[PDB]
Design a protein around this ligand. Sequence first.
Ligand code: NA
Ligand code: NA
Length: 232
Amino acid sequence: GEELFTGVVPILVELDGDVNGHKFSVRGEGEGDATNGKLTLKFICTTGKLPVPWPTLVTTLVQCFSRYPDHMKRHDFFKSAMPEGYVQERTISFKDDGTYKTRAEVKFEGDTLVNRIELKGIDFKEFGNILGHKLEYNFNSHNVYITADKQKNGIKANFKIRHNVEDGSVQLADHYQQNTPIGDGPVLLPDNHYLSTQSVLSKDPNEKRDHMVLLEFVTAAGITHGMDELYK
Ligand code: NA
Ligand code: NA
């Protein structure tokens, strides 16, 4: 599994969404460099204007590209499930607002890592921060807290995204996550740990379509056994 991620790997992302009955599609393309934990993608709304803010889709739009330190290689569920891949599900609860439910398959198709997603959003406030587009076009750094789920031969994760709001307030989005392998084979079931994630959103000044350019870094941490020799 891990050997598939040496070097730079092309990435395809496809999302079909329905938020409060507003249907939309997103296509993303780019590269991941798991040795450096680096992602670079560009996303387009293929159906017109995106009816929610781009930042609210970042977490949904490939944690197999995390850089796991050498002393933690045996806790990398995501790569261990490759190439057959895994199913990733979330509930994303926007504080004082609606909910996204997402289901994704993350897997290799040839040499390409593909993330194919269905997203359903309900109970959003028509004039709230999301459907009213009051979120700033930026992103904070976050930790993703991971635990094994032996019963499903996979993992769970929990975290809270903080979305800056135009009025200086913060919009919280609580994430609950479950991943399960697509194949029947063994996977690595990790000890508790987390992914440290950083993101930068930008625009392509030559792009006329509704879009998002994304740079992300992801690195795993939170297991310290055993790194003694690395200090000197
Ligand atoms: Na990194
Ligand atoms: Na955090």
